[PDB]
Design an enzyme around this catalytic site. Structure first.
Site, PDB file in Angstrom:
ATOM      1  N   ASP A 139      -3.311  -2.911  19.034  1.00 13.87           N
ATOM      2  CA  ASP A 139      -2.342  -1.863  18.736  1.00 13.87           C
ATOM      3  C   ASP A 139      -2.833  -0.950  17.618  1.00 13.87           C
ATOM      4  O   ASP A 139      -2.071  -0.572  16.729  1.00 13.87           O
ATOM      5  CB  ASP A 139      -0.999  -2.479  18.344  1.00 13.87           C
ATOM      6  CG  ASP A 139       0.153  -1.521  18.544  1.00 13.87           C
ATOM      7  OD1 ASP A 139      -0.051  -0.469  19.187  1.00 13.87           O
ATOM      8  OD2 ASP A 139       1.267  -1.811  18.065  1.00 13.87           O
TER       9      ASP A 139
ATOM     10  N   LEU B 196       0.826  -1.196   0.000  1.00 11.12           N
ATOM     11  CA  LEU B 196       0.000   0.000   0.000  1.00 11.12           C
ATOM     12  C   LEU B 196       0.866   1.254   0.000  1.00 11.12           C
ATOM     13  O   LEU B 196       2.083   1.166   0.177  1.00 11.12           O
ATOM     14  CB  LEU B 196      -0.951  -0.002   1.198  1.00 11.12           C
ATOM     15  CG  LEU B 196      -2.205  -0.861   0.988  1.00 11.12           C
ATOM     16  CD1 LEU B 196      -1.985  -2.266   1.541  1.00 11.12           C
ATOM     17  CD2 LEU B 196      -3.384  -0.213   1.676  1.00 11.12           C
TER      18      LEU B 196
END
Ligand code: P49
Lengths: 297, 258
Positions: free
Chosen positions: A126, A82
């Protein structure tokens, strides 16, 4: 395995993670390299968990793990590639702001990735802007599952393996015994607000500071708001009693629906905190669309 | 009771059918036998008590072992190496604080090298293709426990105990699904402690009826009855502890009256 590694061209470091190319197919990938001989304790626990859990989760809004290469000294995770992470994007957007329609698109997708995680008994644990990846098409994906845990059996809270302070949920700060899926929803709520306001919701300097910043905004919880708070390990009866700030002043740019959703994502009692599943049903997403970002790549 | 609760049970049921080892793998092993396996698992229980590891850890290791053995011939002298690597991997997966390699080499009593163990960790990972997030009897018990209307800690301990016992004996238990062994263990414990039976809510949740559970239940009852006579005793010893309310000292019902 060494033949497979020979098939990759390193393009540039992006994180260690390299942007890389498949010499034979032309496919662009992210390689996460992990050196094994730096600890002599075997494959790391993070790797074990990331790989095993990640390869169980195929979803458009979860970074795709394409392959694992395990030689003797190196372990590689091959991911789809990405274009950038949300933290950098938010930085680049400081002057302009991120357009509310794009914020909605992103929160919407994130909730879908997270909902998929939770319904497959994975806690991310997280969730923070740099662990969220975006592409030029306006897609966003959950990434970095190094701290992710399966909760078929309840997950015990660990001092060292914790989400960074600013996105850490109040249960955790007050010292709860177990994680629940709610700690992820909290982090998302925090990120939602930050995208709206261009500032972190609760930028604490310390555990106790983080806690108070939350109290100052949302009010100091009591037994009525959150049955049990006063019994929690690190709760002190000597906490200041702050009152709950008016929410339109906390996230001014947000309409009624947006204020509604955000406050449910930030509800104190984790039993009552809205779920990703349910958040997706919220009227806030009534008009959702898929804008494309202006990435300064 | 959470709402991903139902999605997750459904998913675990989906998964438990894939993580499934070959039921007859043991007669295809040239050199090892059920007895040797029983000894190995009972040892792992001991190791878990020594290092204060979670039950889920133990259950996961047994899974890894049974799966590895479904496709790899192993010799007597190496069986324990496999179990050690399996225990180490399960610890890394499930424990908050996994013991270090060294500690695992210590408890094999320097039968094996730090090198061998880490080399076997690699091999098991390859063979199991990093699919370590397996469904366990433990997990399904946890799910079933929420549908315990009067929540009862002796019932939970006894069910834990019965389920842990099934780990020891590849015959017959290798031929039941975790969700099913769980169902039997829950009912048998619930029946022994409170006289109640496999509840309506769980029949709806699981689609298992007392009738469907019967064959496994029969086996589990047999194991329960014979437990004091079994050659492997580490689990009974473990479930004498106050932490488990001494349930392994409870007298099993004489008949299940099914
Ligand atoms: C950086 N990073 N860390 C991890 C990880 O798992 O720790 C991962 C990535 C990552 N970054 C990007 N793209 C990207 C490109 C430019 C800038 C930032 C990100 N694309 C895929 C991945 C897979 C997982």
């Amino acid at each position: 395995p060494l033949v497979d590694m020979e098939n990759f061209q390193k393009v540039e470091k992006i994180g260690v993670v390299y942007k890389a190319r498949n010499k034979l197919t032309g496919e662009v990938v992210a390689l996460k390299k992990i050196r094994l001989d730096t600890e002599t304790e075997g494959v790391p626990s993070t790797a074990i968990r990331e790989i095993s859990l990640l390869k169980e989760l195929n979803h458009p809004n979860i970074v795709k793990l394409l392959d694992v290469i395990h030689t003797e000294n190196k372990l590689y995770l091959v991911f789809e590639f990405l274009h950038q992470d949300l933290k950098k994007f938010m930085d680049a957007s400081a002057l302009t702001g991120i357009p509310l329609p794009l914020i909605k698109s992103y929160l919407f997708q994130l909730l879908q990735g997270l909902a998929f995680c939770h319904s497959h008994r994975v806690l991310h644990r997280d969730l923070k802007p740099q662990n969220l990846l975006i592409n030029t098409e306006g897609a966003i994906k959950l990434a970095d599952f190094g701290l992710a845990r399966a909760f078929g059996v309840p997950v015990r809270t660990y001092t060292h393996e914790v989400v960074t302070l600013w996105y850490r949920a109040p249960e955790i700060l007050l010292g709860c015994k177990y994680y629940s899926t709610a700690v992820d929803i909290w982090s998302l709520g925090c990120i939602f607000a930050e995208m709206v306001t261009r500032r972190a919701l609760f930028p604490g300097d310390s555990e106790i500071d983080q806690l108070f910043r939350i109290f100052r905004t949302l009010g100091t919880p009591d037994e009525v708001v959150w049955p049990g708070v006063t019994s929690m390990p690190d709760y002190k009866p000597s906490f200041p009693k702050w009152a709950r700030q008016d929410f339109s002043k906390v996230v001014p740019p947000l309409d009624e629906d947006g204020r509604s959703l955000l406050s449910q994502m930030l509800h104190y009692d984790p039993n009552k905190r809205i779920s990703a599943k349910a958040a997706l049903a919220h009227p806030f997403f009534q008009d959702v669309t898929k804008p494309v970002p202006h990435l300064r790549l | 009771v959470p709402d991903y609760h139902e999605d997750i049970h459904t998913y675990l049921r989906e998964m438990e059918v894939k993580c499934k080892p070959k039921v007859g793998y043991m007669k295809k092993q040239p050199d090892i036998t059920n007895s040797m396996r029983a000894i190995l698992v009972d040892w792992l229980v001991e190791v878990g008590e020594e290092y204060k590891l979670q039950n889920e850890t133990l259950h996961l290791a047994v899974n890894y072992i049974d799966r590895f053995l479904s496709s790899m011939s192993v010799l007597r002298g190496k069986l324990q190496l496999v179990g050690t690597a399996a225990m180490l991997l399960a610890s890394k997966f499930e424990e908050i604080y996994p013991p270090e390699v060294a500690e695992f080499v210590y408890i094999t009593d320097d039968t094996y090298t730090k090198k061998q163990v880490l080399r076997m960790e690699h091999l098991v990972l390859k063979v199991l293709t990093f699919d370590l997030a397996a469904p366990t009897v433990n997990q399904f018990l946890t799910q079933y426990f929420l549908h315990q209307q009067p929540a009862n800690c002796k019932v939970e301990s006894l069910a834990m105990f019965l389920g842990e016992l099934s780990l020891i004996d590849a015959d017959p238990y290798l031929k039941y699904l975790p969700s099913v062994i769980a169902g039997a263990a829950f009912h048998l414990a619930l029946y022994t402690v409170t006289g109640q039976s496999w509840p309506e809510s769980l029949i709806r949740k699981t689609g298992y009826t007392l009738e469907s559970l019967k064959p496994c239940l029969m086996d589990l009852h047999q194991t329960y009855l014979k437990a004091p006579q079994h050659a492997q005793q580490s689990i009974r010893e473990k479930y004498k502890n106050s932490k488990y309310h001494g349930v392994s000292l409870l007298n099993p019902p004489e008949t299940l009256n099914l």
